[PDB]
Amino acid sequence: SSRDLLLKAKENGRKSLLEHEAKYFISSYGIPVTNIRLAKSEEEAVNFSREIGFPVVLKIVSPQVVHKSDVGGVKVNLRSEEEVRKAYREIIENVKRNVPEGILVQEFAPPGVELIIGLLRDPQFGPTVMFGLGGVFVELFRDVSFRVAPLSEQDAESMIKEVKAYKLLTGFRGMEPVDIEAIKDALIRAGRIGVENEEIAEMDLNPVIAYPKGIKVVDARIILR
Amino acid sequence: SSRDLLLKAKENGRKSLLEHEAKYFISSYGIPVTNIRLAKSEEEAVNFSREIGFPVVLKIVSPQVVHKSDVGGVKVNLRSEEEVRKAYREIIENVKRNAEIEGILVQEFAPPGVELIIGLLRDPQFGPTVMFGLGGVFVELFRDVSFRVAPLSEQDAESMIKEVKAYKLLTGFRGMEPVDIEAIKDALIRAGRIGVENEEIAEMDLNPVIAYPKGIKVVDARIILR
Amino acid sequence: NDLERLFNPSAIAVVGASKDPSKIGSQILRNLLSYGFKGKVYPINPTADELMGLKCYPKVSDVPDKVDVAVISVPSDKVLGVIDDCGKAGVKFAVVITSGFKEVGNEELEEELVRRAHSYGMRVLGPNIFGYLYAPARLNATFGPKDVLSGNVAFISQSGALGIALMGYTVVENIGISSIVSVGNKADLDDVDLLDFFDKDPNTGVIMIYLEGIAPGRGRMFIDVASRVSLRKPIIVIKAGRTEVGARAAASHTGSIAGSVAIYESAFKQSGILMAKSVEDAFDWTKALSWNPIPEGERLIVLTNGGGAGVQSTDTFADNGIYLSKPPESLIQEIKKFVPPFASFANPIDITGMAPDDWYYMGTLAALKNPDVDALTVLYCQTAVTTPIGVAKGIVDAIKEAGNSKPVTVGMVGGPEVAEAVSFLNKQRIAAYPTPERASSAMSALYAYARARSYVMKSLAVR
Amino acid sequence: NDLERLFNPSAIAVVGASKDPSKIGSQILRNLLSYGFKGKVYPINPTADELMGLKCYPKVSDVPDKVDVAVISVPSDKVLGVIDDCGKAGVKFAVVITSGFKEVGNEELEEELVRRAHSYGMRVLGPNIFGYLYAPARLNATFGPKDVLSGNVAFISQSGALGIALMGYTVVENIGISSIVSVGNKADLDDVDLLDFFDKDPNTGVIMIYLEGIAPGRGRMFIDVASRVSLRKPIIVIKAGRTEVGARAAASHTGSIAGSVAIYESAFKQSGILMAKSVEDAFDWTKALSWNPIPEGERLIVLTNGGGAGVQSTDTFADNGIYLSKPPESLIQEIKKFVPPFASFANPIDITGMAPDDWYYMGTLAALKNPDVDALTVLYCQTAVTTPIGVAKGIVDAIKEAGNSKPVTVGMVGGPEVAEAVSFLNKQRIAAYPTPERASSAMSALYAYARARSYVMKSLAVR
Ligand SMILES: CC(C)(COP(=O)(O)OP(=O)(O)OC[C@H]1O[C@@H](n2cnc3c(N)ncnc32)[C@H](O)[C@@H]1OP(=O)(O)O)[C@@H](O)C(=O)NCCC(=O)NCCS
């Protein structure tokens, strides 16, 4: 069961899931994520990079590293095996010397319209789902909508239409309309995760990329309590 | 006088200024523009590219060619004689196969920044009116704009800037410095003056205008005559 | 859990009534008798043999009867003892008027009050409340006004002074009341419990709530209950702390943490609740919702003897997302039988400033009788050509003779004669207002509720 | 372009008065006499020897006198003939009541009317109007109500039926009027010309305008004039066609193209004008601005006998960009001399629900006398421990004894006694309202005008 990830985290006194664990968990709820695998060696990756498909992004996985980039724990646009051997040894090299679980091999995410899907716990209303457009639209303008879980289809659709930036989803200069049904589906499932898993205090799906067909969560945080 | 541009255009039965004429006009009002030259020959283009300084953008200039990219009249980041003669030869080629040409516009490179739009329109009741908004989706998709009837005071210019919902894009954010708000106010006021003073200008578009930490630059401009 | 015997008790005790007629307990007892309670009333006082002609007892447990409700009006340092005695007496509800609990920082005393009540199977209303009224039981257990107009509106207030003032204000605004409930500190019984009762109450058709907040962990149930109630009865919430700054301020008055503005709003939308930003808006909407059926379609007609009032109406509706459409040709033809050629039929239908009184009769009658008309807002600008009361009575006659019921609101502008005409209409339970924007906002509340109800229905759709 | 002799004429003619008292002309003549005009009044009728005890003439040019103003109430097919005669008689202003011009598609007739007036140096008001009133000249040349309350508010209306009704409504809302001007089709004289007169009029302190649109090419001067007026006198505009949909509706009613909503709004901001979305807001704001000086600083105090009214106030102010700050320690100390320990001094100052009448006197007096207080909103929720009229009298006494002038608004909530108390306050020109939100919105209008004036001042700064 995916609950094993939460149980293991709790027994080890962790207050969050590691990146791959978070991706696995939300995937098990039917929310599409960037394809990932965990490498316990430089060679274990070749089957996985091959399987996943180049170019693959590499990320260090360690309870220690809250920020992956400052330590030098990230490597982007790796387009071949030789390029994995290099980006792999470099990240081992780098983080070790900065900080003495494995390497995450992650698929490339084609550009699209970025979204955020949140889950928080309100003192009065309990698990609550948050939606907004990515980038400046949430971070700078704070354009978000909320619905208390569980979400109906009516809740998901209306909370999407309610944000000021909504038109970024229905086609504009050099960008096709994106899959709104797939967004609604993910919102509802995010609410279900909150309702069902009491040990999840908070969850962040950020960034989520929406395409003309389907969506993909690129990064996800799950906070425990 | 820069009014000669308006007089000549009208005498030739034109309903707008050509790009180089428009840019010259608004420059004459103290609004900063991309340095430009009009090519009077394929060889005259390199002479200007040299003078202006690489990298240079090249643009078709013709009363007939209403469109930019669709026709194929544009070329960016040309850094040499060879790269100009190449981009020029296509520029004759590309647009025709998609229309008397005034010439080819050689334009200086515009470093990226925060894009703005400054508009001038004529309202039936209130006459010349200045429009402001952030570029890209913010005006075109969201219609986030502010208006002030000309002539504009400094108070009008500043308040109409702060009034748009996208205002915070001007005051520093993730990976972008605050831009020169004073230079924006100054350009708005001067746009209002252009409208008040030049009755044969029906409408004007400064789009895109690029704002930087210091100063601004009009990259493209339309002036419609009446 | 069942509040049937709170609102319809066989026996009520008033603990803390006194020979002194000025004390709160005595004021409550006086209202109970004045308003005409038909059950048994038991004044409770340590020394009095009788109060207001009723046998008095020193303890509720001395009463030779089963007391359903004890209204407690003794100081806080005496409350817990009374609670133990009421518990022993088997009392179901403790209506605790008394102040001096969580609202002044004595959170522990308040929690002990509830803990102690519950150990006896007893529920608590309050504390820190001005009581409650239930019209169908001729029950006025408040120290507020002695009387209210009878009707179908239940008003729940978390605020004290404003709540008791609003109780009086309902009379001036001609709002018929089924119940007034002061909930105060809301330490036990709350909005959810009350909504459950009013849901089942055939006497209550509209619920208005002055609300600051609900207790932690209570929100999910609030939405569950409120949404189902909204399927049949409109809920209007006057939210205290609508803004970030207001939310911070109101929270410290209740001795609580400030709730999320955005999430409350979302909860209200998911509940089908209408959020009012002001007392006037709440009362205006409550009036219309109380006295009208919900529109069954979008075919709203505006009738006016002036373009100007009509435009104010159009703008106001537009602000509420309501847009008018061309009237039915049948309606236009009917009205052309008496209207001048230079009248306008774009909707609003402008019957022009020359319109005498009976044109309002005929126009209103034609509109309401028309099968393709769902709702009617009637606008009147006083002229020398008309009598305001004449116009009002024409509207009344048209409504009666339409032999049906469609939502109607009326806006009348003018001097003292318009003021009296508006009053007349409202006392006839026809929602009337002194401006066209208020009449239009009132009708807008009817459509807002229809859409709110639709939101809830869609959200409960089966997969 | 000087309107001195329009508003203060020596002689007025009424063309189209009749033996028949029911005709418009006769109604206007009756109001002129009734309201007490002291100049010469010349009824003009083809056959009558005298009307209303006054010698009548068949033509204005037959009058042995210089007629300043001709109020023309004959059918459209007879107006131009009357204009030529008035021109020959040298009349300065033609007040053309008559309808049937541009508003019904007769643009050519309307333009002919104006050109012909102008060929004689004559100006036109209207056509299609209900006349005008000027209180300081005891001149009621309307067929509206015979009387208004005297005061300093000038009301200009582009609407007819709504305008004449609003004229009556001012009485009900206790608004003192210096002038009523119906401008109707606005074919010649318009808002700019009228604003120029009211600018210089010492009898007028506030201008309220029901405005649909202004003529092409007139907007720049409108801003030029209005902005300068706003430096000393507030202008409130009720805009008809605030919305896209409303703009189209109102435009085709006037027989014009629809103007830009966004640009009108900017023009109002550049003019220092306050735009009202409703009659109620406009009247509520006009009352406060008419009876109060503008606040000289941000130090606004709210006084309340209940946290709930205070929170409604806080939210409403916040909605208007007005934020309260802590009261001066001196004020807090003054009030602590009579207030219970559990009162709240955060601003609003909560003197608690136990507050008797005289606490409103003392609290108000202390606030208004404090040098670090700029404005005061007093809120009152009726309970049995107070009398509404007592509270009102306390507020009145506090204001008088404060021996100064700071802006004050009052919000009182309660039953019939509060209605009477509010009336009492308003008849003494103390801006009072039946809800805390309306009192707070009214005070917000005082600050809105201060900020608008400041916009204009900075806008006129020298380079
Ligand atoms: C509840 C409250 C009104 C009582 O104040 P009070 O009337 O001055 O208090 P008292 O001490 O006089 O007690 C009332 C009566 O109950 C009697 N009493 C006291 N303890 C009693 C007991 N255990 N059983 C029965 N009677 C009792 C007292 O003897 C007195 O009667 P008396 O005149 O014969 O002596 C007061 O404490 C309070 O909370 N006031 C504010 C309430 C409020 O504002 N609520 C919210 C409105 S929004």
Ligand SMILES: CC(C)(COP(=O)(O)OP(=O)(O)OC[C@H]1O[C@@H](n2cnc3c(N)ncnc32)[C@H](O)[C@@H]1OP(=O)(O)O)[C@@H](O)C(=O)NCCC(=O)NCCS
């Ligand atoms: C102006 C208007 C009221 C005139 O209609 P009316 O009074 O019924 O018309 P009449 O033909 O009866 O004329 C009125 C009087 O003027 C007299 N009259 C006509 N032409 C005249 C002239 N050239 N000189 C003098 N008197 C004249 C008529 O003889 C009549 O008097 P009588 O009763 O003694 O015969 C009408 O045409 C109109 O426009 N009504 C709408 C007004 C309105 O609502 N305006 C907007 C307000 S919001």
Ligand SMILES: [Cl-]
């Ligand atoms: Cl009207």
Ligand SMILES: [Cl-]
């Ligand atoms: Cl209160």
